[PDB]
Amino acid sequence: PVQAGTRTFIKELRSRVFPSADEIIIKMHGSQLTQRYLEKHGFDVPIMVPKLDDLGLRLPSPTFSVMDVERYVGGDKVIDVIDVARQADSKMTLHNYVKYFMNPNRPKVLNVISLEFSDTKMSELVEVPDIAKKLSWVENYWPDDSVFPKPFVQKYCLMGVQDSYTDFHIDFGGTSVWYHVLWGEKIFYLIKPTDENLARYESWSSSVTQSEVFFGDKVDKCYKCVVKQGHTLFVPTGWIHAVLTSQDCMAFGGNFLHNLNIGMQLRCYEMEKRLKTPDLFKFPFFEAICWFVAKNLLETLKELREDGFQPQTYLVQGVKALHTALKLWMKKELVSEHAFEIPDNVRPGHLIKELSKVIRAIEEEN
């Protein structure tokens, strides 16, 4: 059996000529990627922006090194590191990872993919893509007076050695991600979240043979997307993907929830709860933000209704899925595990009623 992450596994991966991600992604200039464009054409496939012009994305020059990351972050910080050949999570001091990274002879393939630095001096060196900030639920609906700590999942520093490999997964909470390669190269294996593919992914995730079964073989198409230096890739809600560091690489990326695919975001959240995924620990208050969002979406629909307008389809679909999720979390036999995420400022039972009728109305008056 070929174990994910091992040298043998990588020889196969590097030799297969998968369908090109050019068959499904949309390439565009940074100025075309607007909230407006996304609301009209949707955000259903990955978007590639080869040049960073007009993205609003700011970051160190191409010579920024891992040594520099250690300076701005602090070698003492303990970080998650993946022992790729064993597909296991380990720990290290940022200091030793950098020592391991610069050592010409690496006894093992180690990868760093969860280093969030918005709480460090390196944060001032990075401004995330404007589009992420425009769409971000956290940027738009997180109150300045919540008891819940604000989630910081917007700035990650990724460093991996050649052949680092991250197996197929869906970003935590169904978030979308922006990913930029500073230097080196990353190759993404993308899989569309069709109802068939999600189902199989959840089955594959809960099978003991997960590490010996290439998930790419269980679906009709697994798209290969090469992300080269200077390029920026945006992956939308629910997309299943694996990543191969084809060569020593440093990249930056971030996660964000938004209003375009709420249903899918909710679906991914529930799946994660069924699989008991450790990633959910990164967006601990997913439910709290959903409550905050339901208040804002309620307001918009109320404003539109009271003035004779019909909301856009995706907004009605999204609110409907939100309504269903909120009602579920409030069920008598389940509310005890959900109550702590209900914001002080919201009235659960009432917010659900208002939502239920605004929806019903739109359903009848249509």
**Contact residues: Fe ion, CB under 5 A:** 136-138, 171, 256-257
CB of 88 to Fe ion, least distance (A): 18
Q: Does the annotation flag 95 for ligand binding?
A: no
Residue 24's nearest CA partner among 45, 10, 3, 39 is 45
Q: Does the annotation flag 166 for ligand binding?
A: yes
CB of 178 to Fe ion, least distance (A): 11
Q: In sequence order, what are the beta bridge partners of 189?
A: 224, 242
Q: Residue 13 and residue 224: Cα distance in Å, rounded?
A: 11
Whichever of 101 and 137 has its CB closer to Fe ion, that residue is 137
Whichever of 9 and 237 has its CB closer to Fe ion, that residue is 237
CB of 81 to Fe ion, least distance (A): 17
Whichever of 254 and 348 has its CB closer to Fe ion, that residue is 254
Q: Residue 112 and residue 344: Cα distance in Å, rounded?
A: 37
Whichever of 101 and 237 has its CB closer to Fe ion, that residue is 237
Q: Detail the DSSP E strand segments found in the chain.
A: 26-27, 47-49, 78-83, 88-93, 110-116, 156-160, 165-169, 176-191, 223-228, 232-235, 240-256
Q: Does the annotation flag 300 for ligand binding?
A: no
DSSP state string for 267-326: HHHHHHHHHT-GGGGGSTTHHHHHHHHHHHHHHHHHHHHTTT----HHHHHHHHHHHHHH
CB of 150 to Fe ion, least distance (A): 10
Whichever of 84 and 138 has its CB closer to Fe ion, that residue is 138
Q: Residue 51 and residue 45: Cα distance in Å, rounded?
A: 19
Tell me, what amino acid is at 207?
A: S
Tell me, what amino acid is at 113?
A: I
| Residue 18 DSSP one-character state | P
CB of 1 to Fe ion, least distance (A): 25
CB of 324 to Fe ion, least distance (A): 21
Q: Residue 98 and residue 19: Cα distance in Å, rounded?
A: 35
CB of 227 to Fe ion, least distance (A): 12
Q: Does the annotation flag 41 for ligand binding?
A: no
Q: Does the annotation flag 171 for ligand binding?
A: yes
The torsion angles phi and psi of 333, rounded to 5 degrees, stand at -80, 10
CB of 285 to Fe ion, least distance (A): 11
Whichever of 110 and 358 has its CB closer to Fe ion, that residue is 110
Whichever of 93 and 140 has its CB closer to Fe ion, that residue is 140
Whichever of 257 and 325 has its CB closer to Fe ion, that residue is 257
Using CB atoms, what's the residue nearest to Fe ion? 138
Give the long-range contacts of residues 318-322, CB within 8 A, separation 24 or more.
Answer: 318/259, 318/260, 318/261, 318/262, 318/263, 319/262, 319/294, 319/355, 319/358, 319/359, 320/263, 320/359, 321/262, 321/263, 321/266, 322/262, 322/266, 322/290, 322/293, 322/294, 322/297, 322/355
Binding site: residue ranges? Answer: 166, 169, 171, 186, 241
Name the binding residues for Fe cation: 169, 171, 241
Q: What residue numbers does the annotated binding site for substrate cover?
A: 166, 186
